[PDB]
Amino acid sequence: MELFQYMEKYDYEQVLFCQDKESGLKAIIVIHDTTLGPALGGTRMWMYNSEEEALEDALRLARGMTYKNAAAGLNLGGGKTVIIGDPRKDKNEAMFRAFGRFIQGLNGRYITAEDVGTTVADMDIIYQETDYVTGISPEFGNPSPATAYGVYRGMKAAAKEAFGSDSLEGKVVAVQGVGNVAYHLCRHLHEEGAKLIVTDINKEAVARAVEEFGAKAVDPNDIYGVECDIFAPCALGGIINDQTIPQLKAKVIAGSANNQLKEPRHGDMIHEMGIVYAPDYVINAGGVINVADELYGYNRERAMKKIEQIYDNIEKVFAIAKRDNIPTYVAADRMAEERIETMRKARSQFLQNGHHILSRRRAR
Amino acid sequence: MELFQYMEKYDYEQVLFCQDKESGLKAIIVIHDTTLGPALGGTRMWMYNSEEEALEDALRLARGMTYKNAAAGLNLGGGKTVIIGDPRKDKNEAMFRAFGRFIQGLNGRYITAEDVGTTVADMDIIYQETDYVTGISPEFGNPSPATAYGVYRGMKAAAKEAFGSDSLEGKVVAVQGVGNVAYHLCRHLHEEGAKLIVTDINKEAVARAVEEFGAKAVDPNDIYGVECDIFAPCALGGIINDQTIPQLKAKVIAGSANNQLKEPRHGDMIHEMGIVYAPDYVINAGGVINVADELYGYNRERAMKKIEQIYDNIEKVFAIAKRDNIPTYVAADRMAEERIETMRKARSQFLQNGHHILSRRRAR
Amino acid sequence: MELFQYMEKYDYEQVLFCQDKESGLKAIIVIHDTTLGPALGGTRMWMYNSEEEALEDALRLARGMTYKNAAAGLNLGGGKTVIIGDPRKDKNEAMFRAFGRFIQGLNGRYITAEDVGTTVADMDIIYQETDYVTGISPEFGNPSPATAYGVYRGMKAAAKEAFGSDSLEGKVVAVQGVGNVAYHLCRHLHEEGAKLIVTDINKEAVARAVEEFGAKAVDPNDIYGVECDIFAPCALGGIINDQTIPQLKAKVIAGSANNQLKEPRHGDMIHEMGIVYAPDYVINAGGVINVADELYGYNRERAMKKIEQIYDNIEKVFAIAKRDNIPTYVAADRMAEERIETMRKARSQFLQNGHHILSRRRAR
Amino acid sequence: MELFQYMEKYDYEQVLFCQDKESGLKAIIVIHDTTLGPALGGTRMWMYNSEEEALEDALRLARGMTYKNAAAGLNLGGGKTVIIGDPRKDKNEAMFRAFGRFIQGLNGRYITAEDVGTTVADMDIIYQETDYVTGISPEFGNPSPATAYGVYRGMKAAAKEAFGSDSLEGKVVAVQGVGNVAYHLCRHLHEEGAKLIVTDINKEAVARAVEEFGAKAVDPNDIYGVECDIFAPCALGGIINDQTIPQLKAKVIAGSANNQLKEPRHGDMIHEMGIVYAPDYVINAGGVINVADELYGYNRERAMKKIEQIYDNIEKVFAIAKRDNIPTYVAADRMAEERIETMRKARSQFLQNGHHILSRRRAR
Amino acid sequence: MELFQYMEKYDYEQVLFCQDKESGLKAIIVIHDTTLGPALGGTRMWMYNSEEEALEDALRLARGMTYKNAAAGLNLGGGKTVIIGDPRKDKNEAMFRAFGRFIQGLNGRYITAEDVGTTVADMDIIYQETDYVTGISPEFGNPSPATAYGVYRGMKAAAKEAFGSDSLEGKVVAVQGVGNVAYHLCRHLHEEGAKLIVTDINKEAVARAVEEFGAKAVDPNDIYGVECDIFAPCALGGIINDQTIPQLKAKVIAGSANNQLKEPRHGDMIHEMGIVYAPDYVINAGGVINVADELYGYNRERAMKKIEQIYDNIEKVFAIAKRDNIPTYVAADRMAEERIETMRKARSQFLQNGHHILSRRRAR
Ligand SMILES: NC(=O)c1ccc[n+]([C@@H]2O[C@H](COP(=O)([O-])OP(=O)(O)OC[C@H]3O[C@@H](n4cnc5c(N)ncnc54)[C@H](O)[C@@H]3O)[C@@H](O)[C@H]2O)c1
Ligand SMILES: NC(=O)c1ccc[n+]([C@@H]2O[C@H](COP(=O)([O-])OP(=O)(O)OC[C@H]3O[C@@H](n4cnc5c(N)ncnc54)[C@H](O)[C@@H]3O)[C@@H](O)[C@H]2O)c1
Ligand SMILES: NC(=O)c1ccc[n+]([C@@H]2O[C@H](COP(=O)([O-])OP(=O)(O)OC[C@H]3O[C@@H](n4cnc5c(N)ncnc54)[C@H](O)[C@@H]3O)[C@@H](O)[C@H]2O)c1
Ligand SMILES: NC(=O)c1ccc[n+]([C@@H]2O[C@H](COP(=O)([O-])OP(=O)(O)OC[C@H]3O[C@@H](n4cnc5c(N)ncnc54)[C@H](O)[C@@H]3O)[C@@H](O)[C@H]2O)c1
Numbered sequence A, B, C, D, E: 001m002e003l004f005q006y007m008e009k010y011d012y013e014q015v016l017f018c019q020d021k022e023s024g025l026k027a028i029i030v031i032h033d034t035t036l037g038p039a040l041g042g043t044r045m046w047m048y049n050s051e052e053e054a055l056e057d058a059l060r061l062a063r064g065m066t067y068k069n070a071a072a073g074l075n076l077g078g079g080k081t082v083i084i085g086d087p088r089k090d091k092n093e094a095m096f097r098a099f100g101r102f103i104q105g106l107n108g109r110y111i112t113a114e115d116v117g118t119t120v121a122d123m124d125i126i127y128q129e130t131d132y133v134t135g136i137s138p139e140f141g142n143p144s145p146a147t148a149y150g151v152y153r154g155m156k157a158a159a160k161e162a163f164g165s166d167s168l169e170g171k172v173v174a175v176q177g178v179g180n181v182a183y184h185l186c187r188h189l190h191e192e193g194a195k196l197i198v199t200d201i202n203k204e205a206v207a208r209a210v211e212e213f214g215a216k217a218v219d220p221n222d223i224y225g226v227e228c229d230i231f232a233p234c235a236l237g238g239i240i241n242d243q244t245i246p247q248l249k250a251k252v253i254a255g256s257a258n259n260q261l262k263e264p265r266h267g268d269m270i271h272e273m274g275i276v277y278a279p280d281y282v283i284n285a286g287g288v289i290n291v292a293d294e295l296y297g298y299n300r301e302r303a304m305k306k307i308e309q310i311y312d313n314i315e316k317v318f319a320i321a322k323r324d325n326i327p328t329y330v331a332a333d334r335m336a337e338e339r340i341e342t343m344r345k346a347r348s349q350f351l352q353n354g355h356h357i358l359s360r361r362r363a364r
């Protein structure tokens, strides 16, 4: 692969291949940047056809988590674990005890959380070996009201961008998927008093939506052509593709879905038309904020006060996009890199007793 | 300025000029005295025309905080920070991360709090770099009921000075400004059963006052000439000036406003007439007590029990003023300096494991 | 002075005005940069006519120590203390106990050493209050053989620059001043087998030089016109001025004197002629290396092995000067700033247990 | 006094004379025995005519607290402080800050609490200097329900001694004094369903007693001659004197009063008659148990479960009194000394990490 | 005795009566002042007729050690232990193990050393229980060359006072007693080249003195009338009495004997005549400096460099005596009290990590 070429083109710190034979563990931990703080990342268990599939996937997700944690305002880096196995039939205790010792042997340099493939029952076996695991605690045990609240605030900011007013009484919001994250979103949007147009691949969830908030049951294939204001995709990625760009009649795209643009040329075309696209990983970053506020000792009010700042994050993305005459998906990356370089240069004076995110401190 | 002459005439320990270029921070931390404990002080952000304006302002406020923290009964010194900038447009994260590291590099020798110009959203960025910051905690998050309760107790003490009885059923209290601190004061004064005469530059707050407690709406320019007993200024400083001294018909001045006397000759004239002036920084010291009780781990009952002692503080000020045949604004300074010198001499025996206000101790 | 303008033009971290009234201390500690490590600097006691004289002097010496400690290879920053007093009649214990507590209250952020005005009898009073003081220890108690050894190595490097050969058998070295630092230098130069031409304002030291190593007694005013190879000034600063540049018949200037060029235009003219000027603060940095190796627990062999690298330091200065087509006194500053920026960027990965120069570690 | 003779006859460890001149403190701390644990004792402020009065008083109370803390089941020794002053007019902050440093300088070897003469407002000034102070905490802030509950349990045990049955439905209890400790006692005695005969020097408290529980208002001088079963003195000491022994018609004396027997010959005569006298410092030891359970972090259920054991303490006193053919006031001392000697001999095996009552341990 | 009156007239911190019955220990520890540091004092074992004899003796020696440790330049207070027993027949291990635990229970607040009555074989039993004991270590094991060296330096200073020249070639020194401390003194005085006149109650030591350095054997009763310059008493106290003042023909009294003046009226008469009396506890303080330098880890060169400063101590005593127009034995007390008050006021700024003499620090 010439793996140091791929590392050198993007400045990856480490890739790290763990293995354990009596338990059957093959894991790839990738730490991209640990400038702001420790590298928080999800632990994803999935079956890949080779090692190179898993390696490329771990490297892309490490870069993505660095820009997410930076542009969210967290003092955390970016990394990602891939466990090569099958989560239906290739789990036991022994691989997670082996894996928790491989995390404890990095000495706090990498913090893990649950992701696609692991549950909060495998981060209890890891917690028996390490402290550097999050999303576990009896105080904590559910990021979906948090992610919905952050999508709500980002939609406020994008509405003040595209229109000037953020009071959404008198707006039309089309929402695809009502799966636990757009559901609380639809709670927030009707409790403000906005009109809702929902769809889903199921109908029982659509029946729940119409019974709760009087939404409009529309078929899933033509959610794209609905004349609305704010289109909020919450189902999958690759939704904005070449096959669907002229189908839109909305000017504000702000949803919780990951990897919304299929190719960056689509983002170029959206910026040439005029659809106000707030970027994908700045809006939906509420769940990562929620699971990173556990590192203080979890408190609901502090974490919701931090999730409230996604309004300001989106507003700075649009300010940089209008200053630099670039699209907004480029403005998100440049916001994050400016925060990384500025905190490299502004935290340079010597202290022999500095605080990081894992520090021992006063109870207060 | 010959800055060591000004430091030597009043025994300032340190002045300390912080600077950071990539974040735009220019700060002046002034530590006057750290005999009793660490130097607690506010962090004030304001735009000054030069450096000398900010320097003179920081030095005056450092001396003022030393006498306030001493005469309140706290084990804390006096200092003050001035950040030279514009709080409407010259804030970001990077200057407060730089500034929090400059506080952490004093090693607990200076504790900061919010003041005129900063909020409790900038002491969360400082808290990511240091423990020596107060007014932040999720247990804590509001000094105004505390400051009003302390003004109430000091008015009890001044009423027992001027009359002998502290039960205020049958008294007349004129209050200017109903802005969040005299409001709870008016709650306390009518729940004792005293008659209220309020005024304000607004009328909606006056309407709220009349609707709540049946106060008397009087115009703001002639609040000074109202025949009353206890005049409680709660709006600005420089109220007692030469233009308004013969306007008074009250004999007890006890309000929460800072810098009440314009010049000390006015205090000389008040003492020559006979108006019982309890001093400004002894009465309104309840908010500093509230934000300094957080250093124990915040508890409401302990802090209110400590705010209750402003009765005794005012009573000792009047005892020293009658012992020493001086005015009361001089009696406040001499009370504070006697407490400083007595705790210098009475805490002189050696211990290798002493407790200060920042010490680690048993949870209990 | 508009002191933040002068701080912002050169990126000073702190200026810090200490004062103590019962002991008579007025001190100015200036910390320029603490990127590489703590700020090591001398404590200089001298009488200045005002505060502004002392302030300008402290600021210049702080910048000079930053570039010296950087270009020497040390993990130390640059700072400087000025005590405003008279060392003949205004010393006692009480000001150094007060001053040692003001250094201990920076928490290791600034390390002090002896300099022009203090002795190793005032850094014993400071040592009773702090650990952040160097040059004191009973293992240690004499930087002059170290500084001479470093001047010897730098002269080796400048001789290989100007000629190609470093074996100095068959060279002519003119040395002014034989005061304890050029004396061991003349030991090294005749034990290699090089011819010496010494001078001094005294004659008894010249008699000692001629009796020891057979040097040539030449008058002090015409040491400049002596036809030689390597001219080694070791007396004062401002030697290379406009009045003496055409007097030289030497092509290698390498001496232990501080502030050799009077103005940088003189360095421009030296580079236009062709005299190989190795810069002043790269050669004579052996004494600072000697007093900074005490921070490990002093060992003579490790410190001499570190002083041996001034050959490589001079060789990199000449490599940058030939790469960048600038003079050598500019090449020294650019070497130091490249080392500062490169160690800012190469030590950026997170550790929660990093080592600095003041760290506790294994005895081994 | 030949003070070491008095110390040697009873094995006092230390007497310790503290003094502070600028605050006016003259204190006598007496530590009798610290075998079981640290010496807990009250701090009593009172005016004595000389030093010898205070010294004899401190020595008697130190021995009394050793036998109380031993026979109660606590891991605490016995000591006592006497401050020589006047609590009406000779208190300030400075003497308690001086005194708290003199307690902190014993290093946990002596723990102080409130007693006759100090309040819980002087153990807040001491708490600013030391951890070895009890009865202060915001969790804690009232030993009187505890002392009453313990008197109730001891009366249960004495009733099973004198009769065999502990169910007190159908008994007659005469109680003198209804001052906050016999009041909750009378609550417990009527909620079991026992008949009450109360008296007091006041009548309003007697009116409260008759209105609450239907007690019988009897004059205070002839409470001694009332035909009853269990006489419970709760007012003063010296009640059982020669003038009142034939006045009794009761066979169970069990009250919360200190120093009940005037001379031990009275206890000899009570044991010769047959009145079941449970001793004074075994019954009323509930308040000391309450203020010593704060040293764990105060919990109400654990402390009440420990106060419940006074039944077993009284039962062992009567078992030793019937085994050894001695009176019961001698049986209390011998119970305590057997516990002291047995815990000297049974805790003799070496540990390098033992637990005492002041130890740091797991939160759990 | 009214022991708090005697404590209050001189500001004694503590008197502390230890006792242990199974070992037979009766000890009186007196701590006078612990402002400068911990209280260093000797442990003296002697038989006194009562307690009051021992108590008065302990109090006088505590005050004397405070002024000695202050005027010597040490960071140590003054205290003194008296053990009431007979050192010929009333020692064992058990009393020193009991006593070492009573010193460890003061927590470093009092440091003990050997004195009249104990040896360095009883401070090995104490060292098995505590660290706060000095004069014991295998590095250490002999204050007499130190005390002689300090007497030599003080005699240098008194010779420059009385004459102007300190080079003692051509002087006459009469020395009584040649017992281990004047012996090394006579070594120093003839190795400078001064003429010696020795005497002693023995003759074999006088024969050793004449054989070594050619001294002059003079009878012991008329050592006082010898026409000399510097009279150096080294035998006992009470030498300068009314019976011997006109016998002197010397003008410089500088010897190592304790308690040289019988009454202070004798010192008044010496100052009225003109005999330059350097005070007793400033000259002979070399042994206390030697045993207090062990607290750093003992090093001979550092301790001798500190003993060298007795020249400067005597010079400041004479400067204060000529400034204040008082005798010199009063000038010694006022030098010490000025050092105590100045270090109370100059070490007042807050640090949470200060160094004292018992602090843990870097090995270096
Ligand atoms: N929960 C969080 O905090 C968080 C964080 C980041 C991203 N997200 C993203 O939010 C999206 C959904 O959230 P979730 O995974 O937590 O719950 P979810 O998977 O239950 O919600 C998805 C629902 O969308 C519907 N769906 C599937 N295909 C669809 C299609 N073509 N068209 C319309 N609807 C379709 C289904 O009802 C599905 O249950 C996901 O893309 C997830 O990655 C969530
Ligand atoms: N909150 C505290 O704990 C605390 C502590 C110390 C001092 N203070 C002082 O209390 C004063 C007011 O308290 P605040 O700042 O917290 O709330 P605030 O500023 O809202 O109250 C001030 C109100 O007074 C009225 N006002 C302005 N000018 C007036 C004028 N000429 N005449 C009459 N009323 C006028 C306005 O209604 C104003 O809102 C201030 O001077 C403040 O410095 C408060
Ligand atoms: N010792 C070190 O480690 C070190 C470090 C850095 C710089 N230096 C520099 O080295 C120089 C001298 O070293 P030093 O101060 O340690 O010992 P030093 O002061 O005793 O040596 C200087 C001697 O030069 C002679 N001198 C004075 N004026 C002269 C003149 N016009 N011409 C010729 N000679 C003259 C005198 O003999 C003088 O004693 C100084 O400039 C010092 O700053 C020394
Ligand atoms: N509160 C405790 O935990 C505790 C602990 C140990 C001992 N005690 C003892 O309990 C006794 C009383 O308890 P307290 O001090 O806490 O409250 P208290 O002092 O208010 O109760 C005493 C009351 O007894 C009455 N009194 C006074 N003289 C009397 C007399 N000749 N005859 C009858 N009644 C008389 C008065 O009403 C008095 O208020 C005291 O002797 C106290 O020492 C209490």
Ligand SMILES: NC(=O)c1ccc[n+]([C@@H]2O[C@H](COP(=O)([O-])OP(=O)(O)OC[C@H]3O[C@@H](n4cnc5c(N)ncnc54)[C@H](O)[C@@H]3O)[C@@H](O)[C@H]2O)c1
Pocket: E143, E144, E147, E176, E177, E178, E179, E180, E181, E199, E200, E201, E202, E205, E220, E234, E235, E236, E237, E256, E257, E258, E284, E286, E287
């Ligand atoms: N060793 C120290 O560091 C130190 C410190 C402080 C004080 N001193 C004092 O130094 C004095 C002697 O020193 P030492 O005790 O260590 O050794 P030491 O007791 O052996 O020296 C005293 C000698 O003086 C002689 N002596 C006794 N009576 C005499 C008399 N009337 N006239 C002349 N000589 C007489 C004897 O030879 C005696 O041995 C003592 O007063 C001691 O208190 C010593």
